[PDB]
Design a protein around this ligand. Structure first.
Ligand code: BE2
Ligand code: BE2
Lengths: 331, 331
């Protein structure tokens, strides 16, 4: 109790916690030793101070230990595409996952139980870890879904918090290459530095000017990139990779069925006008994944390859093939 | 729920709540409609943003409505001496209360259930509102003790918060003249402005450089003063009123009995060296009360009168007389 109260005191004085201190705190929360009021206070306080690199890294190490894991790190072109949650677009990252797989890379996608969409798409998620790893290894795409004590405070507060940050940072499959979306420009560099410390090889950390935790079709996107042990920052426009920047109109959906309908349009051979808009936003994001997986040697090249897959229809077939596979696994 | 989540969102963007918004929030908390996590978040977030004048005033109005009240505002030289809690000194304000009464002013002291000390001093606090008002009216001194839903979150977080600020601001007896201690220099002016808006006549809001929510014997004290409808800020040294500034050594106590022992020394005719130190700190604080009550026309004059009472022993007799009275009331 004293440790948490002490942590809260420092935070009000804008004093960052040490790795040691954050580790103890996150352990307590995970072990159920922190009160709901204390969890709410920690989330709010850390968010307003700004979570430091050490705070986030220490929290991530604690959560990773307490996760059921697999290890598919032997696979070449292994990548995860994952966001904190931003500021109701269709499921771009899930759509991108199939493009990435169809391109010849492998995605082990860490998700938050998207889940409804896959189910709508005839993809059985009632799968254990062993069955998920089979999807990853044999189909080039699997979906990883899962602490307990944070779920209530998170829904009640409704804010973006360190627990959002920790989602991307706790892939349980041994993935080392990532496209990570975050909910502010100032979190891009820090999260890249965290991923470095957790052993990552290549990551793009992104946040668009229009407030998305992904690369936007409508605005510029701020990038922090970890590559070859170093972190750089740069800015992206769709035009930089021969894609026109368009408004997000028609890309906001009401429910899971509308999202799947738009995605199948966007990934199919005969695209509508809004389908072509969706296809282009997917190309920008799937492109980042193809690039950081190592399969393409630049972002531009990755986007090109993505574009080829999206307009050729192969990603839509990868969807269908995964559906048949999962249904086969369940029998 | 949405209102609280919206409030929390604004607070993370350092956007102050409106009076209307804070009123709804505080109502929900008071009505039990806010979750513990949400209360913890609100306390932390408001503290780190800085509670605004409107936020504090609106919160105070809501709490005042939900209080059992009396009205002793007809009494001349009516004052309350009260603090937020600061950064373990003996009970200076309780000691000061008896000096203030013995000087001919009347104190209706809002306290937080100090309580143990009075009980140790043979003062029966098992009194209803009617019996307390009798103490105030007939003895010149009574002690007012009491929401439910904040007590847990407050103890768990351990931080100073808006609920500390609200204690001084919710006297239930109709008092209009105050010495209020706060836990930082930057809260002095704001709280004075709040008290103005709540209808106060004369208040000194104080915080010492050494971190006390009272006037220190050891350091300078920052003052924000509401007088004649206007707020001014000034700084105080003990020397300004012919009292030597001494360290707080010997004034920190371990328990209630040690506090009462020191107080009776400090208020008695034959004082020890530490008793004289305590007497002087009480003179500085009781002096402020005599001044803002209207009984003295300046702070310096108030301190002089306080000093006379403290060294003459009359405050110690006021203690004994209140003790006999309360014991008589209970029979
Ligand atoms: N944003 C996430 C991404 C992946 C897994 C969990 C989360 C989460 O918010 O809890
Ligand atoms: N500081 C106070 C002063 C008077 C009454 C209550 C309080 C309180 O903190 O709740």
């Amino acid at each position: 109790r004293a440790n948490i109260q002490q942590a809260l005191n420092h935070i009000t004085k804008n004093i960052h916690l040490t790795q040691a201190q954050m580790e103890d705190v996150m352990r307590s929360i995970m072990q159920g030793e922190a009160t709901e009021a204390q969890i709410g206070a920690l989330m709010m306080g850390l968010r307003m101070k700004g979570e430091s690199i050490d705070e986030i890294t220490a929290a991530a190490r604690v959560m990773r230990e307490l996760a059921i894991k697999i290890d598919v790190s032997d696979i070449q072109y292994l990548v995860d595409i994952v966001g904190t949650g931003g500021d109701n677009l269709f499921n771009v990252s899930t759509a991108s996952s199939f493009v990435i797989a169809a391109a010849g890379a492998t995605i082990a996608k860490h998700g938050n139980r998207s889940s409804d969409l896959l189910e709508q798409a005839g993809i059985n998620l009632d799968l254990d870890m062993q069955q998920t790893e089979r999807c990853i290894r044999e189909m080039g795409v699997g979906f990883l879904f899962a602490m307990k004590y944070a779920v209530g405070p998170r829904r009640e507060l409704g804010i973006r918090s360190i627990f959002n940050l920790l989602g991307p940072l706790t892939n349980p499959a041994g993935v080392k290459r990532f496209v990570i979306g975050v909910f502010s420009d100032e979190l891009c560099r820090p999260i890249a530095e965290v991923m470095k410390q957790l052993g990552a090889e290549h990551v793009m950390v992104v946040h668009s000017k229009d407030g998305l935790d992904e690369i936007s079709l409508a605005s510029q996107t701020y990038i922090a990139e970890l590559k070859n042990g170093e972190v750089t920052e740069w800015v992206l426009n769709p035009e930089d990779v021969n894609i026109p920047s368009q408004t997000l109109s028609g890309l906001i959906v009401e429910d899971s069925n509308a999202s799947l309908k738009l995605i199948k349009d966007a990934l199919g051979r005969k695209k509508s006008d809004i389908g072509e808009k969706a296809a282009n936003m997917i190309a920008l994001n799937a492109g980042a994944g193809i690039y950081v997986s190592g399969l393409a040697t630049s972002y531009k090249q990755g986007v090109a390859l993505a574009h080829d897959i999206i307009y050729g229809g192969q990603a839509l077939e990868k969807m269908s093939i995964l559906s048949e596979f999962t249904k086969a696994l369940k029998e």
